[PDB]
Amino acid sequence: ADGVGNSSGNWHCDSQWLGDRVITTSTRTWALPTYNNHLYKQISSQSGATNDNHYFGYSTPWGYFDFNRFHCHFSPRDWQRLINNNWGFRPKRLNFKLFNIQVKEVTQNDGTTTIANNLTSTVQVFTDSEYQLPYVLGSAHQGCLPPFPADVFMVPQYGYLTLNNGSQAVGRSSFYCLEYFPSQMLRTGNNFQFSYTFEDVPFHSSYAHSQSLDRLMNPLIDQYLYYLNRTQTASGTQQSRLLFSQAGPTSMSLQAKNWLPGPCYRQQRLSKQANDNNNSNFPWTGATKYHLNGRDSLVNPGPAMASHKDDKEKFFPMHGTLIFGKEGTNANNADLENVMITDEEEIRTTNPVATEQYGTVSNNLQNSNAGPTTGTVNHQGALPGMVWQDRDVYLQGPIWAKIPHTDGHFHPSPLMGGFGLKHPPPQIMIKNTPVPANPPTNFSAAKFASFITQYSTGQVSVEIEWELQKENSKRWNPEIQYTSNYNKSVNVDFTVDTNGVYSEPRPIGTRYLTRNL
Amino acid sequence: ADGVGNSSGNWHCDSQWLGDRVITTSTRTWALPTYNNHLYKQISSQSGATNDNHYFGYSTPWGYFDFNRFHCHFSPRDWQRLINNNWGFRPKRLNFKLFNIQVKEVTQNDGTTTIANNLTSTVQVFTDSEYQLPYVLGSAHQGCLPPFPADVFMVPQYGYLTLNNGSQAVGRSSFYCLEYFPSQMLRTGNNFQFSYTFEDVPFHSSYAHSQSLDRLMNPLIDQYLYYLNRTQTASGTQQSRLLFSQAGPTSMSLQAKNWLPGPCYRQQRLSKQANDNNNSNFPWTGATKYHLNGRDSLVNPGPAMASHKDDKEKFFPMHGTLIFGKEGTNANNADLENVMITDEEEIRTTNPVATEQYGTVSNNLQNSNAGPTTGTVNHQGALPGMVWQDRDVYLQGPIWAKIPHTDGHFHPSPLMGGFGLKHPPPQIMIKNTPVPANPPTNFSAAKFASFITQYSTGQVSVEIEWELQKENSKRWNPEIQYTSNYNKSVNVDFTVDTNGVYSEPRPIGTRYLTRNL
Amino acid sequence: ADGVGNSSGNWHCDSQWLGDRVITTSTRTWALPTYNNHLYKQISSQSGATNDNHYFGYSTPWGYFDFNRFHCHFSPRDWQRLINNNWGFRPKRLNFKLFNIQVKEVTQNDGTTTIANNLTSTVQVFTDSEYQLPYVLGSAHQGCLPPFPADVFMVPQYGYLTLNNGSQAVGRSSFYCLEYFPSQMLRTGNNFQFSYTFEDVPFHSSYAHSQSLDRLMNPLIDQYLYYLNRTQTASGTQQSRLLFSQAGPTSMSLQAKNWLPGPCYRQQRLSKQANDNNNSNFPWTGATKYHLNGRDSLVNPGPAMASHKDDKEKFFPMHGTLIFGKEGTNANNADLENVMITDEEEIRTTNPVATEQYGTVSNNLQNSNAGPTTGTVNHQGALPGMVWQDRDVYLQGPIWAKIPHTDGHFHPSPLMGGFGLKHPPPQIMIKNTPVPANPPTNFSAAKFASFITQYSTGQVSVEIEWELQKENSKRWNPEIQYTSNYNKSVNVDFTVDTNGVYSEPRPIGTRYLTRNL
Ligand SMILES: Nc1ncnc2c1ncn2[C@H]1C[C@H](O)[C@@H](COP(=O)(O)O)O1
Ligand SMILES: Nc1ncnc2c1ncn2[C@H]1C[C@H](O)[C@@H](COP(=O)(O)O)O1
Ligand SMILES: Nc1ncnc2c1ncn2[C@H]1C[C@H](O)[C@@H](COP(=O)(O)O)O1
């Protein structure tokens, strides 16, 4: 209830730190085109694609808003405060607003374009509260709010996939008409709002451990539990004998322990230094992949596993980490120097190394005649007594994902990162209401193909309230912090360049502060 | 009381199932042109048309809204729920809204068109509550709301017919000026609404019978009523004698029965297989037709009668069923493969077969000299003790019709299908108020032929509340349900194609669940 | 709550006349066997039967009680009181009881049978209130309570028919397990009861008319309406001329009249005198029949139509009347003297004669050249202004029938006779609970084929309250009454013979008293 000449909202970008919680707000400007001429179209993989790449689905005229990346809600400085001072954080509740809507009509005459306000035109917005539509958010697609507030972004088109057989469609394939959901219709002067409250979810670990999993022992004291030291006599004629000893400071690897490392599903190892890697093409052939319904699919990034062992910085697991492009990077065949490869190194203390075997097991029964042989375990599922760390969340990266609705889920934490949610923040859908062009003067029952070309722009605000977990540590010596380099440079990190382009030089994980196991 | 910049309504398309009742809402976008230059014109059949095809009437600038098809209010899934779980349904009350009106003015300069908002222009809407205008709704014309919500449709022009003699007009011919009815005038920011309540009407049968009409007997037990078994001696010299017997399980056709099949008016039989039908042109000549005021008219589809007898799927009665076109079908001379021919087969148990005689009667009085002869009854009116089923309603098909106001009506159920109503949902009329172009500067009493070319678009919502009748059956074995084929296919049924075109592959009747007679 | 040694009910057979209403009670003794070894079996027509006689269905172990014949509730004297003194009667409410149950176990050793009380054995009884089972009552099957109270009858087996194609079964065929309905289980000392209330139903006509339909005129006075007396000049050279006259006492057939006779569907005429009928076999071939779903079925007895015209007592319509056998009559090929053929003669005044045409209509358009020709109408459906009488109810004959549940019914009065009911008196089902014989001593999952042979007997009471409509007539002269012949005879009518066999010598209609139209 405003009208043409009254702004329907204000610009709120600030972040405020209450010290129990942080409330981060982001207001951005957006532009929504008219997708595929107001038409639902089915889409399917082109025949000739490999079996693994077939798909069947539907593309819709609707757009949608996704804030699911962290840097939407945090400036690099606000991110620094969080990761430096806190052991954990989780989202509590969010608030969403659309305001200052403008709908522009576009005419094209000869080689000139003309844009004019359409004051009576309408835009449609609905949030899906009941999760009745396919949920495309957690797939780490582009189209999220820009990192830098002054940027204007384009609203991505909404489309979804369903069951397929080859490129065809089985009878269970669902078709969803989004025009079948009650949606609010807005003009210039109308605004949209809703609130949301996150369900209870474990704090993310903002900490790295100060202890290895196998080192929890007291280094001074000797155990009371014996282990088998010798299966053979030490001196004289070699003879079979069983000899036992108490494990202690000198040999730690031999002691009894209460816990096991997290589950492993092994990765191939790549070398950053050129010419060290094998010469052959094996992203697909030599990879680790899961076979689902006759289709192979990479395991990416996969179960959380340390990227590299001690003193091996150069190597990284193939398809085992999140990779981010630097500004201006091609979407096809970018060089290693252009991408930013994240590192899981903090989880060494519990999780296995992604490129190394889980361990070793005995594959036979020995006797006097047959010597003991042992097999190598390259994949291990959960065993009683395992402990593990989840993959780290970055400044740019998924905040949440929707736990698929199924009978069973095991440790439902998104494998890209973030907060697994059964009821994730709803999908906000938006489209431009069709405006017909001049109808014929004699009735025809054919459907209109003739529409006025138009688009809409506006403002969007997202306010999320994040709960914090403070550092209680008694650690004497100084902890690692995330710091900016003091040395001079042509450009400042996390800042626009001479041409106005915002860029993020490096990925920033959240794990700096240290805790004990 | 809104203004230019406030939307006058919201988009509500949903359906909600309360389990006693279902409330189905449909919101669509429409475009209304300017019909025949704001002029009432009389229309009449061109001389040279056959006597049967003459007409006389009037075409009006007004448009109108018709939701009278089912699929307007039901998605194919909502239709599946209804027909599978319910023995009957009837409409209770509806609610209608027009909102977000836009009036566009169109100029044409050289080969370029230009469309701009006319903010002060008006649209006129009135509902006819008192049924004072001719009622054109129940005639199964095009122009109803589209099946699929995302489509935009064109509002059909309103015109009506009255008495004629040849192509001329008798003095009783009525002329109705719709500009003579109080109507509401709306600008952008004004909206229109009314409510309606259906009169008590019999539930439609959503069921098929589990028994034939002639099989209601107990198959185990023998009757106490005798019938005439033999008019002649069984053995020896043939002699006239009357012999009686009790009819029983062995011969059921001979038993006494309390009820008769529904009335029959016979149809010609056609074969779907090419070359089986006769070679000659007889849609008109060999048809079944009623002769009214010197004009022949087909009986279409006609009294409800079963389409075919047992084990004769290929044949169908000529002009005896509803026929729907598949998407993209020509309106002229479409092949049998393009049309969708509905089937009345469920009513075999009571109604006669449309292509078969009603029965046989005796045309003489026998004696010893004259043997009994008997005539064939090809048409039968109501006899005491008849029972019959009404024609089935489809997903696309008439919901209601207006029972003509007359002294007498017999079983006033529309012969196309649906709910006969004495006070059907009113007609909603709409037109664009004329806007003159620049008048001359010297007074002339001639009428304006000079108008600003313009059209209007907007939004329309229809909310109907349907009452349901639940299945009480004790049937042990599983009932037939309407199911989608599981096998894979290029396209999914009841879904858009690659080019964005919504299509309905087959007509869906409501009769699946079974009841006893 | 009685036990072995307490009778659970008393014998009430009396009838009592309150003069507004009559309350007739009937108590009888019954015996229920074990039908088809406790098994549901499907039953179907044997292949080789004619198309018309095919059926498909199920036979159940359950029995049932049917009182639907009149003489169950009325003695011949109570029937005489009713039909003589009353213009109409209809049922109001009934009350039903089962009591004094006895279950007997039967062993057979060599050629000797032994019957002993099983005190712990159970019988199952349920009434179907919701009409969920097939309703087999109105089909005029045997098994009703005997006419004469001292007789003991056997409870008939319950089985039902459903859709068939040939002798096979279409997927819509319903199977009903009666063991799926909550039923009361009784031992000796338990009794069963329920009450029922008939829905409002028209009084049956107990009267015959004192006037013909075409004679309602004043015989003294001449009409003011002219009719066409002469189409040709009376004298001189014959010339076309139209001459009109007022119809009056001399010619009554020519007068204008307000009403038409009831609808006719014509019957073949048979002669009771031997050798007068044609010599050939035509019960099936020369009959009147309705064709339903590719099967012919006789119309029996058919729409109510007078049996014979004035002074033609000997002839009767073929399949047009109810026929009852005299005591001791064969069920196959009984002679004309053994059967009792009912007569509809009372309805002459309105209904057409079953063996005569309805009338005559003109089949062409005359001119000077073409003389008028006219067709004969052998079948007529309802026309505005028709009046008709329903078929008469006899002392032995159907009381009611269930109006099939369908969309439309026309004058739903059973064509055998009686009271059409949408909610007829419920079906009372009964069976003997299975008692296994000694099981094997080692578990086997096969079903028991081994049962203790047993049957049950007991008492059944039916009390119906009938409402009466008194004679108001001013008729001066004495009306016909139903009287017993005074002349002496070897046996008395409606009485046992020397051998103890009750017999009914003649059918007794209810129409004696006369009313005006
Ligand atoms: N990311 C995520 N989302 C939801 N549930 C999770 C997740 N990770 C683990 N779990 C499950 C399994 C943990 O033992 C438990 C901790 O819940 P607590 O709240 O700590 O009592 O919740
Ligand atoms: N379609 C339709 N509309 C209106 N009236 C109809 C229709 N079909 C039948 N009838 C009439 C004739 C029925 O016997 C009666 C049932 O009304 P009931 O409500 O079941 O008591 O109503
Ligand atoms: N046998 C039978 N059962 C049910 N309905 C019937 C029957 N015969 C006729 N009718 C219908 C048609 C009559 O015009 C009306 C009289 O109902 P009234 O009660 O007299 O107002 O009821």
Residue numbers in the entry:
A (entry chain 8), B (entry chain 3), C (entry chain Z): 217 to 733
What does the paper say about this structure?
Adeno-associated viruses (AAV) are single-stranded DNA packaging viruses of the Parvoviridae and belong to the genus Dependoparvovirus. The virions of the AAVs are composed of non-enveloped capsids with T = 1 icosahedral symmetry and diameters of ≈260 Å. They are assembled from 60 viral proteins (VPs): VP1 (≈82 kDa), VP2 (≈73 kDa), and VP3 (≈61 kDa) in an approximate 1:1:10 ratio. In this study, the structures of the AAV7, AAV11, AAV12, and AAV13 capsids were determined by cryo-EM in an effort to complete the panel of available structures for the defined AAV serotypes.
For AAV13, the closest related AAV serotype is AAV3 based on VP1 or VP3 amino acid sequence ranging from 94 to 95% aa sequence identity, which is followed by AAV2 with 88–90%. Nonetheless, when superposed, AAV13 is structurally slightly more similar to AAV2 compared to AAV3 (Cα RMSD: 0.65 Å vs. 0.72 Å and structural identity: 96% vs. 92%). In AAV13, the only significant structural difference is observed in VR-IV, which is slightly shorter due to a single aa deletion compared to AAV2. For AAV13, a critical aa for this binding is K528, which is not present in AAV2 or AAV3. The mutation of K528 to glutamic acid results in the inability to bind HSPG. Similar to previous observations, a structural comparison of empty to the full capsids for the individual AAV serotypes showed them to be largely identical with overall Cα RMSDs ranging from ≈0.2 to 0.3 Å. However, a major difference is the observation of weakly ordered density in the interior of the capsid maps in the full structures interpreted as the packaged genome. This density extends into a pocket underneath the 3-fold symmetry axis and has been interpreted as deoxyadenosine monophosphate (dAMP), which is positioned between conserved prolines 421/632 and histidine 631 (AAV7 numbering). In the AAV serotype structures determined in this study, the histidine side chain preferred the “left” orientation in full capsids. However, in AAV12 and AAV13, weak density was also observed toward the “right” orientation.
